[PDB]
C-alpha cells in the first residue's frame, strides 16, 4: 500500500521513527496552504499582510 499525500506531510513522516517510509518521485502539482477567513471578513487584509511579512522575515522557513 502506497499513499498519495501532500509533500509537506510526507517529508515530516519521513523524519519520524520507525523511519520506514520514504517520499518518492517528484511532486504531482504545485499549490499552497493559506490562512482562511469567511468571505468579506474584517481580518482578511491584515492576516494576508502578516503572512507576507512573516515569510519575508524568515519565520515560516524557521518554523518548518
Ligand X SMILES: N[C@@H](CCC(=O)O)C(=O)O
Is residue 16 at the binding interface for a copy of itself, with CB under 8 A as the rule?
A: no
The binding site for L-glutamate consists of: 6
**Residue 6 or 14: which CB sits closer to ligand X?**
6
Name residues contacting a copy of itself, limited to 34-53 (CB under 8 A). 34-41, 43-44, 47-53
- Phi and psi at residue 45, in whole multiples of 5°? -60, -50
CA–CA dist 62, 55 (Å, integer): 9
Q: Match 520507525 to its residue by C-alpha cell.
A: 18
Start-to-end CA distance of the chain, whole Å, equals 28
- The residues of the shown chain that bind a copy of itself, judged by CB under 8 A, are 1-10, 13-14, 20-41, 43-44, 47-58, 60-61, 64
Amino acid at each position: 500500500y502506497a499513499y498519495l499525500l501532500e509533500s509537506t506531510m510526507n517529508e515530516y513522516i519521513e523524519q519520524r521513527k520507525p523511519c520506514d517510509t520514504m517520499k518518492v518521485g517528484g511532486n504531482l502539482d504545485s499549490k499552497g496552504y493559506g490562512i482562511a477567513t469567511p468571505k468579506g471578513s474584517s481580518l482578511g487584509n491584515p492576516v494576508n499582510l502578516a503572512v507576507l511579512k512573516l515569510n519575508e522575515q524568515g519565520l515560516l522557513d524557521k518554523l518548518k
